[PDB]
Write an enzyme that holds these catalytic residues in place. Structure first.
Site, PDB file in Angstrom:
ATOM      1  N   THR C 143      79.177  65.260  55.561  1.00 37.43           N
ATOM      2  CA  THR C 143      77.994  66.078  55.761  1.00 37.43           C
ATOM      3  C   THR C 143      78.290  67.556  55.567  1.00 37.43           C
ATOM      4  OG1 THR C 143      76.103  66.436  57.239  1.00 37.43           O
ATOM      5  CG2 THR C 143      78.260  66.431  58.240  1.00 37.43           C
ATOM      6  N   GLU C 252      69.188  93.300  52.371  1.00 38.84           N
ATOM      7  CA  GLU C 252      69.924  94.433  51.833  1.00 38.84           C
ATOM      8  C   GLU C 252      71.388  94.095  51.588  1.00 38.84           C
ATOM      9  OE1 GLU C 252      69.462  97.753  54.383  1.00 38.84           O
ATOM     10  OE2 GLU C 252      70.443  99.215  53.070  1.00 38.84           O
TER      11      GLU C 252
END
Ligand SMILES: Nc1nc2c(ncn2[C@@H]2O[C@H](COP(=O)(O)OP(=O)(O)OP(=O)(O)O)[C@@H](O)[C@H]2O)c(=O)[nH]1
Ligand SMILES: Nc1nc2c(ncn2[C@@H]2O[C@H](COP(=O)(O)OP(=O)(O)OP(=O)(O)O)[C@@H](O)[C@H]2O)c(=O)[nH]1
Ligand SMILES: Nc1nc2c(ncn2[C@@H]2O[C@H](COP(=O)(O)OP(=O)(O)O)[C@@H](O)[C@H]2O)c(=O)[nH]1
Lengths: 426, 434, 434
Positions: C143, C252
């Site tokens: 997983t 940003e």
């Protein structure tokens, strides 16, 4: 109006003024805050010559303080009259000369010369017409004799017109002070005979002989030896700061004395000088103050005055005095001591009398003479300078900095021509 | 401001540094735990040359401890002076060199030389006024000679122009321990001529002579011998740690005292160095101890100073001394004629007077005296101290004894031959200049 | 307002999330039972990005725990942090994938992927300012790789424009456990280039080097390694959880640090990271730790930063730092020349200073230091970290070892070949741009 800056460089000249500004502070009635407390305005009407008043009367001295280390900065700053100086002028480096001329001239002094050059420019832009510079430094050490040497070589580019007072201590014949002391002398005077106007050769040795006999002081504090240097310098500029029956500026003291553009190497003198208990037992006459001035005791340098000839006698008398008794005895010394003068120069006495004595006396005398026995000052050092060049010792502290060998010999030839010029008229 | 770094290499670096930094905590008022008491701030006037500030007055010494053996370093990490020093400033070794050159020049040193030069650079980048180096070493040590020559071979590449100072012990011609000390003293003189500004020497026996006669210490050991050397160390720093009328920095010492770049090896002397009782019946003036400077029972290297020729004698005074009798007594030395100069140097004098008198160690054997002199006298008696050691080296070399340790450790035997021609002209130059 | 959701997939997702959410309860003053004390309301200034409000101050974490194995999830459902999380946010598995791709990409994942994407959408519809995703995963997990690539394949269909952040562990070339980690790292790089904004990597060994030398932790385990990574996680969130003079949001970060949409894989660094005693003997200034940022004993991936070429170096400071020496020290970095750039990017710097200093974990091994730096440095040393892993994958693939697990689980073998040509040009692009 007629404005004079005072610049200190090297560890010697930094602490000479530190007691000297105090008397200049006290002769004009000001405080470490610069607060004028003079009762009579005679102490104010010529306060401007060494000060720039700004913003409610805190007078700042027109002074520049330069060192290659921050050691001598804080001692003057935390010491007496530390709050009086302008912190704009506290320009310094981080090297220390280590008693090396080419460090003070070529290597380290070449960096810090640019910062104070604008400071020399800055206070000279705020005045109408400058008058001349006064400079205190050393000739034995490395900082003042290496950095203050180069400073005079750049004043003439800014001001090729005015006068240059370069007051500096000189070596003594008895005990040398530093190891490269004959190296710091010949290389400095090589630049001093080029662009300077007066040097006062004060011996460190004979200042004790003044204190040991007159003052009788067993414990010579370095505040007290410069205190006798302090009262000598304040008596020279008494005409520009005080009125009287005859005023004589520094240029008149220049033009009367120096006969040829090299021979300007003068020794100073001061009278009266004695201890505490001999005050009342002697006389405060013109005659008693006369003969003290012409003794070997009053010779602040350790040269013999009866081994030379007085060329120009400068009598800067301070106090309310009778002019005729001054006119009487200055004749009488040449009727006694005609061998002790140069013969072909008539009327060797120059007299300037201000009617204000210094603080602490009633009648004083500030003497500056020109004996040709100061030829022996450059006789004794030219052998010690050529004592170690014959074995080429310490060359790796100068050529390792990048000094020429011809820089020694070009100075060495001009050193030996200097004593030939005292020999020309003796 | 000005900031000076100390490096301690070898066991002589360890315990001499355990005395000098112990003494400086007294002369600035700094408690050994690491912080300062608030009473000693006015005493703490320009103490910034050795002690960085940290958090609240916590003063680490700008000092590096270098050893190939962790044993004597743990003495520092057991006593009261553990919390004063910085841990990553302590760089230790594990395997010993055992007074062998290439075991201390190549073997264990080259695994640790890259760690310590960073710690040099980590501390020295804080400096804007980096003056000099206190490197302490021996002459016969494995790291005393093999690593010390390699260390000065690398810092001159890094910093160059900035000054250096070496303190060490002159091996006595009669009483000394390690048999390889005539070997390693020739080795530590070989490549450290080029890589050292100045190096000082003291004798074990010349300490003992004043210890027995004047101190009256008839059981001395390496405890009290570290205190006596540290007073000579502290008297040089008194020109820098305090505010004096006429004082001198480290660049100025080498400028006066090095007439030629090879002969740059003076020694030390200290006076008055007596016990606590004999100063009571005597008023030690300036002319007393200054005349005591130039008698052979006061030199710190057991040799003949009258058979040496003085070239540049340096004087640093401490305490409230007036300069009048100073200008008399040095002239009164010149009235005597046994003090011989060279013909070309009459002006080899240095004047230094500090206001602070030397303060004595607590519980020590000394006495609180205001006047003291740290005499430095470069002379041609060093050449007579060269011939006593050049006699030891060559005759054991001729039979090739003890060579079978130097061979397999990464070292060549022709390097012994080149140092012979190197040291032969060195002691010649005392007579050539003289 | 702005609200950020975290997803924890794999066992590395479990216990790293057991440290980060443990740390945030300290930095906001929230008790682990679920409610808050009334003293920490003034500290609780704009904490709304992670914690929904419920009834009376009861703050559930916007966090999803995804695991195919119920064992380590029960550790959360045994300890003190059981009542903090939401039960239907915990979605568990029963049958394990055992570090196999198609067992974690098709087998157990496709029975549980429809349950968890609802719980994504159930929580994200409360958001008006949904910023980004904290997805934590491994590279060799079943997983960790098979479900993580499938999960990012589906959320970009759902949300798209909104940002993502991946934290993971770089597999060491020498010391690592699972033999299929060279296989699955090629698989988790295959389709996650297109479906991930940024992904970060750390080494097990590069943590250990500072743990042994600076922390002096000679028995570390997965307890204390989770705390060190979580400080790097918390320092990014300090730009968002508090009010700073010049701070930065998640959109940003990717705008500055991604020069090209394929090469978008920088790493992390943290300093000062030492023990509690060594900060006492040292005054850590701005120029101290910023110069400590760019030495190879400080990078969090064990590689050669000097053999890499810096392209966009990001700096986030914490604590009361003045910007003057910041504007000096980054310029003082530029005075040094070992920090190599590319010819086209001199302006790849990011300035971020927050008022809040980092607060240390209770009972931990760290020390309360005001200054700290979270260094992010995208470089071409990642390419040298690609070649060490591309060497491992191909030679085991050539003998076709361990293929007999990948076959029957719903997986094709040509997908191994296409990822080889995919990863070959990737490490080329470091040299093509560089
Ligand atoms: N007076 C004194 N001398 C010391 C002391 N420690 C070392 N020495 C001198 O150091 C010289 C030899 O160097 P060692 O210290 O023994 O060896 P080392 O410098 O540690 O170098 P290694 O051989 O590598 O261990 C000896 O001749 C001693 O005179 C000390 O504590 N006091
Ligand atoms: N340091 C550290 N690494 C972990 C931890 N948990 C998992 N890992 C890393 O995860 C890698 C393999 O993924 P696993 O977590 O074992 O498996 P998974 O992600 O749960 O995927 P499944 O196989 O489906 O269970 C290993 O190489 C570990 O390095 C942890 O708690 N600490
Ligand atoms: N009277 C007096 N003379 C001083 C003092 N300090 C230094 N000198 C003189 O200055 C000379 C040394 O020059 P110095 O400036 O100290 O060396 P430098 O710093 O290298 O230039 C010596 O001849 C001293 O006599 C002082 O405090 N008082």
């Amino acid at each position: 109006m007629r404005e004079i800056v005072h610049v200190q460089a090297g560890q010697c000249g930094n602490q000479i003024g530190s007691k000297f500004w105090e008397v200049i502070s006290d002769e004009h009635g000001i405080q470490p805050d610069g607060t004028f407390k003079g009762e009579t305005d005679l102490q104010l009407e010529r306060i401007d010559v060494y000060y720039n008043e700004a913003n409610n009367g805190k007078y700042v001295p027109r002074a520049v303080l330069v060192d290659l280390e921050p050691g001598t900065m804080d001692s003057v700053r935390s010491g007496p009259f530390g709050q009086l100086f302008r912190p704009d002028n506290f320009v310094f480096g981080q090297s220390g000369a280590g008693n090396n001329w080419a460090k003070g001239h070529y290597t380290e002094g070449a960096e810090l010369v640019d910062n104070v050059l604008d400071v020399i420019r800055k206070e000279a832009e705020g005045c109408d017409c400058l008058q001349g510079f006064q400079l205190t430094h050393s000739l034995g050490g490395g900082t003042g004799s290496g950095m203050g040497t180069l400073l005079i070589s750049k004043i003439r580019e800014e001001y090729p017109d005015r006068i240059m007072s370069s007051f500096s201590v000189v070596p003594s014949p008895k005990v040398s002070d530093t190891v490269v002391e004959p190296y710091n002398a010949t290389l400095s005077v090589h630049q001093l005979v080029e662009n300077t106007d007066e040097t006062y050769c004060i011996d460190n040795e004979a200042l004790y002989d003044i204190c040991y006999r007159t003052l009788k002081l067993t414990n010579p504090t370095y505040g007290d030896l410069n205190h006798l240097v302090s009262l000598t310098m304040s008596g020279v500029t008494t005409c520009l700061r005080f009125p009287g029956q005859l005023n004589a500026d520094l240029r008149k003291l220049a033009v009367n004395m120096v006969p040829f553009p090299r021979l300007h190497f003068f020794m100073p003198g001061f009278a009266p000088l004695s201890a505490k208990g001999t005050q009342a037992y002697r006389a405060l006459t013109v005659a008693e103050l006369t003969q003290q001035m012409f003794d070997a005791k009053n010779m602040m340098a350790a040269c013999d005055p009866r081994h030379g000839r007085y060329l120009t006698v400068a009598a800067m008398f301070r106090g309310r005095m009778s002019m005729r008794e001054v006119d009487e005895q200055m004749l009488n010394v040449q009727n006694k001591n005609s061998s002790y003068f140069v013969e072909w120069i008539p009327n060797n006495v120059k007299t300037a009398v201000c009617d204000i004595p210094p603080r602490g006396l009633k009648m004083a005398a500030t003497f500056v003479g020109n004996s040709t026995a100061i030829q022996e000052l450059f006789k004794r050092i030219s052998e010690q300078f050529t004592a170690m060049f014959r074995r080429k010792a310490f060359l790796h502290w100068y050529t390792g900095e990048g000094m020429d060998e011809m820089e020694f010999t070009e100075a060495e030839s001009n050193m030996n021509d200097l004593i030939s010029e005292y020999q020309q008229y003796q | 401001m000005r900031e000076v770094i100390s490096i301690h290499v070898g066991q002589a670096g360890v315990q001499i540094g355990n005395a000098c930094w112990e003494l400086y905590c007294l002369e600035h008022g700094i408690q050994p735990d690491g912080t300062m008491p608030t009473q000693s701030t006015n005493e703490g006037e320009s103490f910034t040359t050795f002690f960085s500030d940290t958090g609240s007055g916590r003063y680490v010494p700008r000092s590096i401890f270098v050893d190939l053996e962790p044993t004597v370093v743990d003495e520092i990490r057991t006593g009261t002076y553990k919390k004063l020093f910085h841990p990553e400033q302590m760089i230790t070794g594990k395997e010993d060199a055992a007074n062998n050159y290439a075991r201390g020049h190549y073997t264990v040193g080259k695994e640790l030389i890259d760690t310590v030069l960073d710690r040099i650079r980590r501390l020295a980048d804080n400096c804007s006024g980096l003056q000099g180096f206190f490197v302490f070493h021996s002459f016969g040590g494995g790291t005393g000679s093999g690593f010390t020559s390699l260390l000065m071979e690398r810092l001159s590449v890094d910093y160059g122009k900035k000054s250096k100072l070496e303190f060490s012990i002159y091996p006595a011609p009669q009483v000394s321990t390690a048999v390889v000390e005539p070997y390693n003293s020739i080795l530590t003189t070989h490549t450290t001529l080029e890589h050292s500004d100045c190096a000082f020497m003291v004798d074990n026996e010349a300490i003992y002579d004043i210890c027995r006669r004047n101190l009256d210490v008839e059981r001395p050991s390496y405890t009290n011998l570290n205190r006596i050397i540290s007073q000579v160390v502290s008297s040089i720093t008194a020109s820098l740690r305090f505010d004096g009328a006429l004082n001198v920095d480290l660049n100025e010492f080498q400028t006066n005292l090095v007439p030629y770049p090879r002969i740059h090896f003076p020694l030390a002397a200290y006076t008055p160095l007596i016990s606590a009782e004999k100063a009571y019946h005597e008023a030690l003036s300036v002319s007393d101890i200054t005349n005591s400077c130039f008698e052979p029972a006061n030199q710190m290297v057991k040799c003949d100073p009258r058979h040496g020729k003085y070239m540049a004698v340096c004087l640093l005074y401490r305490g409230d001394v007036v300069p009048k009798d100073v200008n008399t007594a040095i002239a009164a030395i010149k009235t005597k004629r046994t003090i011989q100069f060279v013909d070309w140097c009459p002006t080899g004098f240095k004047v230094g007077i500090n206001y602070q008198p030397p303060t004595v160690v607590p519980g020590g054997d000394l006495a609180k005296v205001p006047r003291a002199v740290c005499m430095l006298s470069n002379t041609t008696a060093i050449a007579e101290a060269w011939s006593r050691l050049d006699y030891k080296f060559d005759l054991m070399y001729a039979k090739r004894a003890f060579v079978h340790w130097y061979v397999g450790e990464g070292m060549e035997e022709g390097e012994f031959t080149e140092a012979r021609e190197d040291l032969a002209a060195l002691e010649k130059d005392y007579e050539e200049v003289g």
